[PDB]
Design a protein around this ligand. Structure first.
Ligand SMILES: Clc1cc(C[NH2+]CCc2ccc[nH]2)ccc1-c1ccccc1
Length: 327
């Protein structure tokens, strides 16, 4: 009878009630400006789909961020642009300022507002319990906003979250893997980075939704409060589910695949084993106890669930007792 259908508990029909203009990215008209207004300063990093540079807009002496895209697929560039234009101005969303092409290379490039990234290794050691709560709340504002706009990020991870700690400024970036949520649509499961992949992706359950971002967020929270990076350390996509099963246990995993009538790939047969459900308190040690609290553990337990429908939505997460000290 195949797998059981599923749809988001929130913002289910946001794209359904909007004109095609909004979500039909293949029909979006992209106006490529002139790259001569921008001077590249330094490389900020390298990715699978792009090279990111700190730059200066010479027409106003203002620092910008320039993302040079490896022009692999036109549909994908149009999708990211449309999503960035749709979300432009949303809370803690990277602001697309310009779309340019270098006159000679004609390589697509996206120009963004400047974010001054604090050294992560230096940041990690000095972050307090309050700082974790504060920045988690900031990502949640970004996620509630994009989910409200019918968009799922699908690549929530530390590398996609820019923090300027001096100014307590946070931006969610890299919307290249982002997609419009349409109820009942079957999506490609080959999204997100291995350590942050939700169980729905690993079991090849294609009818996923905004809740995928909430699992990824839970992985980030678990690594931060427990000082264990990454939290679920898989060596491959099949092993990744085994690492999750070593914490959440195999009984709840079989409950999830039975609820949605999922067929577990035969590659899981000899590696999954049998695992008891572990208490979150077991991950507490002398080096992380100052970041752990019963509220933090209760909130984590509500994000890291196999059942994507049982995870807190970004709005429900923002209302959790863990965030009382921030607002
Ligand atoms: Cl998400 C994050 C992320 C970082 C910082 N990365 C920045 C990645 C980057 C640099 C250049 C391109 N990308 C530091 C800390 C956190 C954090 C803080 C509080 C709670 C959870 C996570």
């Amino acid at each position: 009878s195949g797998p059981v259908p599923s749809r988001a508990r929130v913002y289910t029909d946001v794209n359904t009630h909007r004109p095609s203009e909004y979500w039909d990215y293949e029909s979006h008209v992209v106006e490529w400006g002139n790259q001569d207004d921008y001077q590249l300063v330094r490389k900020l990093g390298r990715g699978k789909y792009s090279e990111v540079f700190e730059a200066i807009n010479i027409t106003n002496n203002e620092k910008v961020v320039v993302k040079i895209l490896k022009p692999v697929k036109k549909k994908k560039i149009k999708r990211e642009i449309k999503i960035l234009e749709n979300l432009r101005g949303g809370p803690n969303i990277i602001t697309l300022a310009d779309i340019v092409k270098d006159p000679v290379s004609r390589t697509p490039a996206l120009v963004f507002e400047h974010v001054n990234n604090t050294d992560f290794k230096q940041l990690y050691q000095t972050l307090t319990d309050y700082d974790i709560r504060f920045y988690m709340y900031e990502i949640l504002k970004a996620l509630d906003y994009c989910h409200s706009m019918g968009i799922m990020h699908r690549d929530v991870k530390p590398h996609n979250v820019m923090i300027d700690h001096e100014h307590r400024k946070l931006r969610l970036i890299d919307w290249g893997l982002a997609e419009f949520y349409h109820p009942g649509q079957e999506y490609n499961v080959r999204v997100a980075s291995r350590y942050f992949k939700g169980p729905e992706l690993l079991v090849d359950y294609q009818m996923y939704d905004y809740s995928l971002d909430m699992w990824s967020l839970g992985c980030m929270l678990a690594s931060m409060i427990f000082r264990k990076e990454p939290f679920f350390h898989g060596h491959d996509n099949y092993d990744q589910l085994v690492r999750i099963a070593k914490v959440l246990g195999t009984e709840d995993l079989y409950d999830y695949i039975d609820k949605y009538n999922i067929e577990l790939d035969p590659r899981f047969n000899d590696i999954l084993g049998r695992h008891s459900r572990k208490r979150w308190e077991r991950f507490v040690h002398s080096e992380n106890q100052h970041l752990v609290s019963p509220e933090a553990l209760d909130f984590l337990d509500k994000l890291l669930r196999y059942d994507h429908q049982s995870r807190l939505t970004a709005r429900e997460a923002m209302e959790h007792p863990y965030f009382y000290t921030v607002v």
